[PDB]
Design a protein around this ligand. Structure first.
Ligand SMILES: O=P(O)(O)CP(=O)(O)O[C@H]1O[C@H](COP(=O)(O)O)[C@@H](O)[C@H]1O
Ligand SMILES: O=P(O)(O)CP(=O)(O)O[C@H]1O[C@H](COP(=O)(O)O)[C@@H](O)[C@H]1O
Ligand SMILES: [Mg+2]
Ligand SMILES: [Mg+2]
Lengths: 216, 216
């Protein structure tokens, strides 16, 4: 019910650079969505610095212990790099020696051997889990141990409206692999941010979207 | 004959993390080289932050005006990202809105359209110019204008010892494309750094390598 400042700052910038837009949008399924998100619109030096900061503070706050930050090619490659750097810049002693790595689409791993290292997978978004599945395969081949994942925005929507469990995409992954799926923000945070920027009618109607499709 | 502090700091870290090593090494040609360089050993969060800083200060000092920083896949992708961020962090107002882009090995450009933008190509190293050639092709297809390139270490060696011109690899490129090829350091800087860390005999013998193969 409160937003951390890093989450405020992220969301403010996402809306200003138009990475986050509000309106009527259809997903692949065909489901109405009241917003569109494209992390790729964090595309300047100022914006990428801000994004790095946001991911790094999310990570620091989670208290996850890891050795390597891994980005799935291609979009995870820059995110892994800029985040690794920011963690060493803002995280103190414990984050100086974190490594990054990523895969060539076709060894396959660019970086120090992953053997016996604890890996945090970073990416932009997750839906069906195909990039997470591929990273797990590549990482487990190199004898790494995945301890977590992080994405920018957790849509916090049920994968299906017939699933009784009502697992979201990040929940699905989290269950299957037994690891946390962190995010900078979720749908709930976007809603809290909008308090007093939108009308009561608009507030209602988004707080109703949360009801029909919100996970669990 | 003086080293900027950023160049000192770079070289100190390169030697400590073993990205730069001294000894006897053979190139592909077969030529003796008195060192080995592997930028990929800047592989921690602290080291990548330092590398970002080094490239960004080199760029700032050059006074080159550009709009986009472009990294050739794969190794240029993280370098472009971390450098773009650092430029916005340390460069002031003029560097806030710089964009980055890079190519998929197989559109091909990830980032905002390059049409009418001034591009700085960033990579780790250059020898025959194959990655520069490929970037020029991709960039000129997208109507971008390349205004420069930067690499980490300029080996400052003649490509061939039969060429009368005695052009180095970066010089060759610079001539063919009509653009500056910047670097964080060159062979001359490595030599200046070593003053008083190595013996007179070792100083002589490296200052002799400079004579037989040093460009121009
Ligand atoms: O990162 P690219 O080189 O652009 C390839 P792709 O578009 O597959 O990548 C996107 O989808 C992935 C999500 O997978 P899923 O939606 O099945 O969870 C995630 O990695 C995004 O970058
Ligand atoms: O960057 P990678 O995905 O590892 C591919 P590659 O090894 O071709 O890349 C290396 O060579 C390029 C130099 O080219 P030349 O030596 O002909 O000037 C430069 O881009 C390096 O990253
Ligand atoms: Mg991806
Ligand atoms: Mg390359």
């Amino acid at each position: 019910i409160m937003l951390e400042d890093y989450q405020k700052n992220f969301l403010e910038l996402a809306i200003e650079c138009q990475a986050l837009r509000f309106g009527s949008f259809k997903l692949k399924s065909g489901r109405e969505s009241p917003y569109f998100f494209n992390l790729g619109l964090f595309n300047t030096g100022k914006l990428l610095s801000n994004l790095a900061t946001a991911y790094a503070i999310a990570i620091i706050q989670s208290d996850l212990k890891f050795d390597v930050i891994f980005g799935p090619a291609y979009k995870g490659i820059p995110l892994a790099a800029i985040v690794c750097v920011k963690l060493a810049e803002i995280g103190g002693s414990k984050f100086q020696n974190i490594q990054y790595a990523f895969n060539r689409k076709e060894g396959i791993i660019v970086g120090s051997a992953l053997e016996n290292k604890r890996i945090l997978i970073i990416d932009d978004v997750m839906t069906a889990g195909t990039a997470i599945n591929e990273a797990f395969e590549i990482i487990s081949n190199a004898k790494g141990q995945v301890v977590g994942s992080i994405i920018a925005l957790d849509r916090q929507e049920v994968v299906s409206t017939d699933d009784k469990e009502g697992l979201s995409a990040t929940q699905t992954v989290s269950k299957k692999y037994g690891i946390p799926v962190l995010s900078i923000v979720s749908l709930i945070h976007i809603i809290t941010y909008l308090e007093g920027r939108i009308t009561a009618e608009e507030k209602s109607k988004i707080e109703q979207y949360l009801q029909t499709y919100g996970a669990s």
